[PDB]
């Protein structure tokens with residue numbers, strides 16, 4: 001039975017190596033990574049790979065790894081797939097921990113925009129979680145933390161992290177991670193997966209997919225929002241993604257909004273992530 005070497009980038013930035021039989025489904029590899037991570041609350045997470053166009057794709061746990069990676073390397077990342085709107089309701093601290101690591105990368109990367117003050121507050125909770133109580137010994141007036149807190153670091157930001165860290169004395173890692181999550185979860189791009197698209201008139205928009213529904217970002221002024229309840233159906237055909245919207249009471253016919261994606265594969269990817277978010281953040 002022939003086995004392929006898999007390389008997984010973990011959220012702490014380290015590499016996990018393992019082998020699976022070459023006809024393995026994605027679930028086999030995912031189960032191995034989650035066991036390595038001592039992670040029980042697995043439903044929020046998934047593995048990504050990069051396709052031949054270099055786009056991030058979710059590894060479907062139900063299908064053969066080889067029919068997804070196709071010609072590419074068996075190289076993956078471990079990621080948050082479904083960002084819980086209320087992280088306080090996760091049953092385990094270790095779940096909250098991996099969620100924090102994913103959000104730190106979301107912030108540093110600029111996928112999750114954040115005010116100065118929220119960058120410093122989030123950074124201060126990470127420091128408290130990782131170093132414990134503020135100590136002046138590892139911090140003179142010139143201190144710069146090894147921790148990456150932001151897409152662009154400034155001395156003013158480093159100073160503010162230290163000022164807020166002083167205030168967290170006696171806070172345990174689990175408590176600091178919970179505070180990190182209570183702040184992060186309120187940010188307007190928390191858990192939003194953005195896709196480049198054109199509207200029916202060819203104007204460049206972004207479609208966001210999250211727990212609460214679909215977002216159309218036409219610009220900072222005029223942002224269309226479709227709670228899942230309002231979304232009747234979604235479809236893709238060629239390079240097109242269409243969404244059907246419920247009529248309001250005593251209106252006769254659903255409305256159709258169509259979008260143009262860059263190519264057929266981008267349309268299909270958007271459709272699948274929407275179906276999966278609808279299925280997950282339907283239930284309750």
Ligand SMILES: O=S1(=O)CCCN1Cc1cccc(F)c1
Pocket residue numbers: 083084085086087089090211280281282283284
């Ligand atoms: O994701 S969580 O916040 C973490 C545990 C409780 N959560 C479930 C949830 C949230 C929103 C809608 C729904 F059907 C189920």
Ligand SMILES: O=S1(=O)CCCN1Cc1cccc(F)c1
Pocket residue numbers: 231232233234235274275278
């Ligand atoms: O529309 S479907 O592709 C039909 C089969 C799966 N779909 C689920 C769905 C229903 C409603 C909203 C939504 F985003 C996804």
